[PDB]
Write a protein that binds this ligand. Sequence first.
Ligand SMILES: CC1=C(/C=C/C(C)=C/C=C/C(C)=C/C=C/C=C(C)/C=C/C=C(C)/C=C/C2=C(C)CCCC2(C)C)C(C)(C)CCC1
Ligand SMILES: CC1=C(C/C=C(/C)CCC[C@H](C)CCC[C@H](C)CCCC(C)C)C(=O)c2ccccc2C1=O
Ligand code: SF4
Ligand code: SF4
Lengths: 141, 728, 72, 39, 150, 137, 81
Amino acid sequence: VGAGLVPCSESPEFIQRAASARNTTADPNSGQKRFERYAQELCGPEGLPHLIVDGRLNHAGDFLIPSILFLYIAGWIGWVGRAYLQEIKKRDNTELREVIIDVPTALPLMLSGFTWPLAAVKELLSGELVAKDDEIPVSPR
Amino acid sequence: SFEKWGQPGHFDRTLAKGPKTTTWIWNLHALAHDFDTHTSDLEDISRKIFAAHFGQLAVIFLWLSGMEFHGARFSNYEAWLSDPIGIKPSAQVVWPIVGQDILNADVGGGFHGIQITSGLFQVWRAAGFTNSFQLYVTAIGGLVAAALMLFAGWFHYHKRAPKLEWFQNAESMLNHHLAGLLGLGCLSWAGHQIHVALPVNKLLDAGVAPKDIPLPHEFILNNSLMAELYPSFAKGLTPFWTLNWGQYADFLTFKGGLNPVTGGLWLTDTAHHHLALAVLFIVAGHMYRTNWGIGHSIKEILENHKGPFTGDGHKGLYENMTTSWHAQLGTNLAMLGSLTIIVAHHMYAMPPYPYLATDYATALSIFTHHMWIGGFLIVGGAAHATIFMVRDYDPAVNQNNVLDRVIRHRDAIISHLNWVCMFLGFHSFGLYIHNDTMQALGRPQDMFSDTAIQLQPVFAQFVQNIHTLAPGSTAPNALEPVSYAFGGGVVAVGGKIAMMPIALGTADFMIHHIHAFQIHVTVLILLKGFLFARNSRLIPDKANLGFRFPCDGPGRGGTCQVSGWDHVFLGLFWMFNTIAIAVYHFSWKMQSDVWGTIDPDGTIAHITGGNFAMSANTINGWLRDYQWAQAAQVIQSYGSALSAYGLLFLGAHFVWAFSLMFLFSGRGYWQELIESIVWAHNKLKVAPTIQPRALSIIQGRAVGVAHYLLGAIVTIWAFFEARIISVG
Amino acid sequence: MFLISWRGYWQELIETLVWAHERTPLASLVRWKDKPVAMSIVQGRLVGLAHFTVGYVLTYAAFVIASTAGKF
Amino acid sequence: MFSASFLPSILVPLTGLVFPAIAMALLLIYVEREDPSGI
Amino acid sequence: PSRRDPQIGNLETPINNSSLVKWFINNLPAYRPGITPLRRGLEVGMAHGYWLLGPFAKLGPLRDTDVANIAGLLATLGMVVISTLAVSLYAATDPPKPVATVTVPNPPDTFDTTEGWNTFASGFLIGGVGGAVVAYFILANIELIQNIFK
Amino acid sequence: LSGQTPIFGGSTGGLLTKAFREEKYVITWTSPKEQVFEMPTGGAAIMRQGPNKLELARKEYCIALGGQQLRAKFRITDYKIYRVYPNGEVQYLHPSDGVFPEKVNEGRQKVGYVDRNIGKNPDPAKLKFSGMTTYNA
Amino acid sequence: SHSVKIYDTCIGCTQCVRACPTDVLEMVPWDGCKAGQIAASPRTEDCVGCKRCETACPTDFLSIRVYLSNAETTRSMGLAY
Ligand SMILES: CC1=C(/C=C/C(C)=C/C=C/C(C)=C/C=C/C=C(C)/C=C/C=C(C)/C=C/C2=C(C)CCCC2(C)C)C(C)(C)CCC1
Ligand SMILES: CC1=C(C/C=C(/C)CCC[C@H](C)CCC[C@H](C)CCCC(C)C)C(=O)c2ccccc2C1=O
Ligand code: SF4
Ligand code: SF4
C-alpha cells in the first residue's frame, strides 16, 4: 500500500471534496455517506482512491469476492446453456425448436443449475466433458 | 383468431421451410415488402399498399397526439405563454434517479426538464392555445382517429376490398384530390384563422388576460365583439350578395412584409393567400375528363406534341405511368425531394409563424432537417427510376419515342457530361488551392477577393436590385417588398436581428460554382447507372441477370461493382458531401453577417464579425475560422446542471471508424476465422447447430455505408446543436 | 477514393470517352501509342494502400517536430 | 553568400528540367523500339 | 441517313455535316489543298505565335512592371521551341499505324509521313517566331492608337 | 451473303476504327416474321423477312442474341456466325458442330486430356527450374 | 489465353457447357461413369475469365477449374475498341 499514497481518512483534499460532495440521488446524505464509506481505502495527491490487489487483507475482499461472484454466475449460465443444447438434440426436431424455445422444458434446466461447479468436477474426473481428437470429425486443413 | 403469426416465411415458399444457416435470418428482414416478387397479380398488391398507407397514417396520429400530451402535462407552455422571450420552452422532464438528476433543464419558473428545439409552441402562439385540457381532448381525438382508420384498413382488406378498375382513374384522382382535398382543407383552415387566430393575436399585444379572453363559442353567434373591430364585419354586411368587396378592407388585406409586433409577418396576408390558393386550384382541379362526357382526352394531348427534332413526340407513355408502380414512385419522390429542399431554402427569409426570426434556435434545426430529408429521398427517387428501368419497360410500345431517343445516343451525352464535370471541378478547386498557395507564398496580391484580383457576380446583384424597387409599378397594390434580404430596411426587434439585406461579394462565386460542380457529378453517377443499366459496352446481360448482384467474375480484369445500386452508393456519398458543405455555408453566413445583437441605433453587432471577406478564401482558414468556433465549448460544455448532457460526438467517431472497417476488407478472412472458432467450440461440445456464415459482400457494403452516414450526421448535428445552445 | 470504388464502373465511361476522339475533327489526327484501358484490381489495391500510408506518414511527422520545436 | 562561386545560383534548372526532359524522351523512344536491336 | 450505314456509330446531326461548317473546315491550312507542308507549318506558327503571347503578357508575375512586353516575348519563344521539340520527337517515334483518323469526306493530304512531319515542325518554328515578333511590334508602342487617338 | 438489314434508324454505339481494320463478326438466320426486338448496343429495332444480316464488332452479343433472344423467345436455330479479316477475307468459326447440339457426335476432337486426381497434385518443390505447372502427372 | 483444367468428377449434367458464353467447351466421348461424354476445352483462346462455368458445376469440388494465366491479348481482354 506504498507508492506514496495517503490514507483516504486523513487526506485533506479528500474531506475538502467531501464537504460540498454533490449528493447524487434523492437523499441528502447520499454524497457524504459515500465519502464516509471511502475512509477504508488510501487516497493520493489526486484525492481519489487507488485499489490494491494482492490478497493482502488491507484490500483483499475489495476485489476477491466480486471475482468469485462473477465466476459463480458465469459458470451457472454457461452450464445451463450447454445442458439445454445437449438436451435439445434428443428430440429429432432440432432446428425447428432452435428458434422456438420449449418453455416447459427450458425452465427446469435453468432452475437446476444449483450445483454446477462440483458436478462439473465430476464430469471432469469421469471425462464427460471432452470428445476425442479424431472422434470429433471437424476436418482442419 | 390468433393461430397464424408464428408461421414465418408465410409470404415466401423458399425460406418457409427452415433455417439451415444464419443466412435464413437475414433474408427474413429483406423480402418482407416487395410483394411484386410474390406473384403476378395486381389487385392484391394495391390492397397491401392501401393497408400499409393506413398503418403509416395511424402511427402518424399516434405520435402527434402523444407529443401533444407531453406538451400539456410536462411542458412549460402556459407559463411561457405570458412571456415568449424571457422563457425558453421545454418538455420531457428528467426522471430523478442515479444518472439523470443533474440534467434538470430549468428554464425559469422552476420548470426543469429538457430545453427542446422544435418550435411547436410557435404554432401554439398562432393557434391561440390557453389551457392544456383542450389539448388533452385533441390528443384523444388524434389517437381515436388513428385507431379508427386502422380498423378501416382491416375492414377494407379482410371484408370488403376494392376491385381492379378502381385503380386507373387518374382523372377523377386529380380532380377529387386537387379540388376537394386541397381547396376545401385550405379554405377551412383560413376560416378557422379569421375567426380565432387574428382575434387572439390582437389580444396578444398588451397582456389582455389570455384565459379571460372568451372562447370560440362566444363568437359563433356573438357578432358584437366581432363588430367591435372591422366595422364591415358586423355580420359581414354580406356585400358578396351585392358583389361589392370594398367593405372588407378591414381584415382581408395585402401588406407583404414583417410585422415588428408579432415576430413574424402580417397574418392577414397569409389568410388572403390561402383564400386565393383555395379557389385558384379549385378551378384548376376542375379540368380533366370524367363521367359527364366533357373534358381532355389526356392520352391524346401527348400524341400531338411531336415534330422534326422530336421524332414522334410523347407517344405511348401511359402504359408506363399506370401499369407499373415504381415509375410513379420514383418521379413523385424526386419532385417531393426538390420541393422539400426549396421549402428549406425558403422559410428563413419569410417566417410564417409568430416569433421565428427572433427565435434563433428552431430556425436552422428545421432548415437542416428538411434539407437533409430532401436529398436523402431524391436519391431514392432516382433509385426507383433505375429499378423501373430494370423491372418495367417494353421494346414494342417504345419505338423512337422521346424516351428511346436518348438511350440510343447515351455515349455523347455522358461524354460531354464528364467533360463539364472535369472542367468545373478543377476550374474551381484548383483555383482555390492556387490562391491558397499564393497566400502561403508571400504573394498576397495574387489573391482573388475584392482587395486583389477581381471577379464579381453581377447577375445576382442585378436581379436582387430589380427585385428591390418592385412595389408601386410591378406591385401597385403592395406595400413593402416581399423580403428584406434583397432590399428594404433592416427589420428587427429589440437588440436582436430579424432580417437585413444580404451582401454578395467575391466569395459567393466559387462557393456557388462548387455547388454546381458536385451536383453535376452526382447527376453524372446517377444518370450513368440509369442509362448503362440494361446493357453496357462489355456486359450485355445486366437486365438479363438483375440489378442487385456483386460482380461477374474476374473477367476483363475486374468487374466488381457493376450493378446500379452501387452507382447510387457512390452518389449518396457525393450528395452527403454536397449537403454537408451547403449547411456549412448557410450556417456560417447567417451567423456571420445576418445574426448577432443590436444597439439602440439599430447597430447590428453580428456574432462572428464578417469572416468570409477575411478567411473564407483559403483552406487552412476554413478549418480555423469555422470549427474553432464550432467546438471550443463542446470540450467543456459539460459539467453542471444545465450542461451535463455529455454529447455523443466523442461517441460518433467510434461508429465512424467501425464503419470504415467494413468497407476496406473482404469476407473470406472472416469466414476462416469463423471456422477456427467453430473448431474450438466443437472441441468443447458447444457447436451451434445453425452453422454461422459470414456476411455477404453486398450486406457488408450496406452496413458499412449505413454506419458511415450515421456517424457523420450524428457528429454534425451534435456540433451545431451545442453551438446554438452557446448563443440561444 | 482508390479504396472504395472498384473496377466495374471506371471502364464504362472510358468506352464513351474513347468514342470522342474518333469523331471530333481537327483533333482526330493523332492516334494511340497504345490502347488505354482501366487499371487492374491488385494495382488498384496497391495504389490505394500507398496513398493511405503516405498520407499517414507526413502529417504526424510535421506535427511532432513542429510541436517539439514550438513548445520546448 | 560564402566563399564558393555562383554555382548554386544556376545549376538546378538543367538538372531540374532539361535532364528529366531528355531522360523521358529517350525513354519513350526506347519503349517503342523495333526488332531485334535497341539502344 | 448516316455517312455510309445507319448502324455505324455516327450520326447525321446538322453540326458535323452542315455545308457551312464543312466548307469552313475543309479550307483550313490543315486540309486546304494546293499547298506544301512548309506553308502549313508557316501559317500555323504565324497564327499561334501571334496569339499565344497575350495570355501571359500582362498576366505573368511581372504583370505591371515596365518590361513585361519582352518578358512575355521570351516566354512564348521558349514555349514554341518546346512545342516544336515535342512534335519533332513525336515524328521520331511516329510510324505505328501511319495514318490519321479520317472523317472529312476525303483524305486530308500526303502530309501524313515522317519527313513531312519534320518539315512541318520546321515551318511551325519559323511561323511561330514570326507571329511572336509581329505581335510584339503591334503591342510595342502602347501609343499605337494614341498617335491615332481615334 | 445477304444484302439487307432490320429496321433501325441509328445510334452512336456502332463501329469504331478497330472494326473495319481488325475484325468483324457476322450473324445470319431466318425470321420469316418481322417482330420488334432489342440489341446489345442500346436501342431497339425490328427483324426482316427470311434472311437477316446482322454485322457487329464483338462476339458475345451474337451469342446472347442466339441463345437468350432467338431460340429462347422466337425459336430460330440456324443462325451462323463468321469472322471477317481486316484485309477483306471471310472466315468460319461456326457451326463448329453443325446443329448447335453441344452434345452429339460420332467421334469428337481428341486434344490432350487430364484424368488425374487432385489430392495427388505436384508441389512447387518437385517441379523446379521448369516452365510448366501442376499440369504434369 | 488463360489455361483450362479438367478432372474426372464430371458427372455429365452439362450445365457448364450451357453457361459459358465463350464457346470453349465440348463433351468428348468418355467411358468411365454413366457420362460417356466428358467436358473439355478445345477452344481456350477465347477464354474470358468470367468463370461462370464452374458455378454451374454441381459436382462436389466442381470438376472444372481455370488456371488464370498471364498471356492476355485484345481477345482475352475483350475490348470493342
Ligand atoms: C406537411 C407535414 C405534415 C402536415 C400535414 C398537414 C398539415 C396536412 C393537412 C391536411 C388538411 C388541412 C386536411 C383537411 C382536409 C379537409 C377537407 C378535405 C375538407 C373537406 C370538406 C368537405 C368535404 C365538406 C363537406 C360538407 C360539409 C361539411 C357540410 C355540408 C356540405 C358539404 C357536404 C360540402 C405532418 C406533420 C403530418 C408530417 C410532416 C409533413
Ligand atoms: C465483421 C465482418 C464480418 C463478420 C460476419 C458476421 C456475420 C459478424 C456478425 C456477428 C453478429 C451477427 C453481430 C451481432 C450484433 C449484436 C450486437 C450481437 C448481440 C448478440 C447477443 C446480444 C445475443 C463479415 O463476414 C464481413 C464480410 C465482408 C466484408 C466485411 C465483413 C466484416 O466486417
Ligand atoms: S463439369 Fe459440371 S456441367 Fe460440365 S459435365 Fe461435369 S458435371 Fe456436367
Ligand atoms: S471464364 Fe469460365 S465460362 Fe468463360 S470462357 Fe473461361 S472457362 Fe469458359
